[PDB]
């Protein structure tokens, strides 16, 4: 690349800085000038015909980017041009294409093929270097306007399906999922049939790692209220396990995926978490030690160390007396009706106190 800041007419000045391009590129570059203004064949040429063998060109590829925005069908020649980005197998100068074509800044996110084009490209381009900074680039305008063309919605649904295993992580998996599942849930992909495999994904997010705390991030907003519990999946499987505390209530509910996953550590984890919670919410946010001994069916020292497992769960987060005040505040598992009736008695308790507190402090203010 040499400068583009002359009269525009970027077409035959890209042709100039394509003379130094690939041999397959520059054998069409100056030839295009005889044809037309040549932002159709000569523009698609450096896209069709591969680079010399390095991404030293990209400074010219930014010209080729902004040279089909206004003149050509942008989206048609920007679906390709962003297939070279993986065909090269690098994501740093292919990434400067992705960054300046991210959204709404030289490109103008339509209607949202422009977000997808670079999104699905970047997916193939980088490991997850460019890919991570597109959770904001997506979610910032998810909150203002979701893609009206459900084609673009199921485009990003397939993206958020394979961005499960694309970036090597389990909480990124949860993040990209609880985007996949949330716009699936609210309005998308019903399509009850093509939501079925997505239920098998959402149960993996519930089960493989314990990041519904048991089944709360599947029941709270709409991740089962959409992805139906007692559909053909039996997603209520983990809800039959959610209050019960027994090997049988995970093992009779064990079907032929987690039969071989398998289940021998998370059983005890999620079991003593649902017991910890409903223990706390009963007897009564300050329960006794020998009650928990009999509850969790083991003796003293292990259960006293399961208090430390439960304060790291962040479900029961406070100071632990040895003989009393065992499970404590922060009711982190599902209290689906009890938290709602408590929300009304607490906004009552607020309107009772904090409104009294206004005129109280305002006496000396």
């Amino acid at each position: 690349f040499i400068d583009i800041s002359e009269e525009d007419q970027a077409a035959e000045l890209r042709a100039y800085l394509k003379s130094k391009g690939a041999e397959i590129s520059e054998e069409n570059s100056e030839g295009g000038l005889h044809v037309d203004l040549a932002q159709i064949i000569e523009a698609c040429d450096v896209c069709l015909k591969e680079d010399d063998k390095d991404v030293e060109s990209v400074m010219n590829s930014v010209v080729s980017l902004l040279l089909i925005l206004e003149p050509d069908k942008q989206e048609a020649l920007i679906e390709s041009l962003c297939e070279k980005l993986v065909k090269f197998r690098e994501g740093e100068r292919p990434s400067l294409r992705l960054q300046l074509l991210s959204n709404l800044f030289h490109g103008m996110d339509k209607n949202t093929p422009v977000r997808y084009t670079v999104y699905c490209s970047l997916i193939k381009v980088a490991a997850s270097c460019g890919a991570i900074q597109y959770i904001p680039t997506e979610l910032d305008q998810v909150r203002k306007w979701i893609s009206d063309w459900n084609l673009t919605t199921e485009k990003k649904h397939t993206l958020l399906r394979l961005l499960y295993e694309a970036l090597v992580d389990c909480k990124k998996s949860d993040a990209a999922s609880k985007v996949m599942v949330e716009l699936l849930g609210s309005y998308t992909e019903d399509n009850a049939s093509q939501a079925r495999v997505d239920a098998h994904r959402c149960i993996v997010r519930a089960l493989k790692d314990p990041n519904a705390f048991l089944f709360d991030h599947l029941l709270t907003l709409k991740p089962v209220k959409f992805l139906e519990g007692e559909l053909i999946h039996d997603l209520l499987t983990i809800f039959v396990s959610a209050k019960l505390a027994s090997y049988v209530k995970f093992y009779q509910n064990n079907k032929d995926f987690i039969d071989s996953l398998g289940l021998l550590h998370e059983q005890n984890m999620a079991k003593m978490r649902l017991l910890t919670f409903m223990g706390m919410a009963v007897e009564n946010k300050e329960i006794s030690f020998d009650t928990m001994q009999q509850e969790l069916q083991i003796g003293a020292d292990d259960v006293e160390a399961f208090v430390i497992d439960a304060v790291r769960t962040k479900m029961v987060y406070c100071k632990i007396d040895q003989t009393q005040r065992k499970v404590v505040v922060s009711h982190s598992t599902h209290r689906t009706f009890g938290k709602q009736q408590w929300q009304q008695l607490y906004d009552t308790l607020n309107a009772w106190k904090q409104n009294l507190n206004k005129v109280k402090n305002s006496l000396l203010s």
């Binding site: 689906t336 904090q354 203010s365």
Partner: protein, 272 residues
Amino acid sequence: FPGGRVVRLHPVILASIVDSYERRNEGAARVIGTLLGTVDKHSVEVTNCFSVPHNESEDEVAVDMEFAKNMYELHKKVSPNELILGWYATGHDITEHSVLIHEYYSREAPNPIHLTVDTSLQNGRMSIKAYVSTSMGVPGRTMGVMFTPLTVKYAYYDTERIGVDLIMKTCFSPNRVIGLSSDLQQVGGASARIQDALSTVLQYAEDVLSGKVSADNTVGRFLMSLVNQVPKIVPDDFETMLNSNINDLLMVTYLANLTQSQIALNEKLVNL
């Protein structure tokens, strides 16, 4: 990886924008300056800035780079925080005059980092769009530059942006400080009632049918997070603790007032 992602300035950049813009030396429409700050090599964390002499029009623009070095000399002396990362202008984005000030700053010639402040009657458009200029090959014309966006972040001294929070209280209606903490109780009250009016509609929406969607285990998670720290669960020995603290704190200020009287009885017996 691309360096053009984000500028994390804070409203002191807008301080030396607006004061400079509204005195201006009658630089009517276009006030411009050279931005000074740090870089995380991905982010651009910035503290301060300054407005320079310009006369930008078609096709005359001046940035006294001798003076920009004079100001940097005085700026680096003021605080060692910053390097001249580029130039910040008022309205607007890519011009043929931007790229003239580009080649003026390719006399300087670190990474070109620009900050364009839209001067329009809008809301949806941001009052600043921070830009870097890659590609950036350029042995040709003036400078082949490509404006890639830097997200506008305010990430510095939190008590400063508490100072800005007060400035945004003055933006609505000043809001002078005599009873700061006195009428921060009125602020704390207003906050606690917005919480109440929030929680009420959340309940009564599901009391009818299909409400409290985005609240159940988020606002409910952060309603038990209210009672996490206030109140203390229900200990009446904690009532006893803090009414015994009332006995302590009253008695701290009690002899503070005994010193108040003693100030006059000490230094004003001087006046006989």
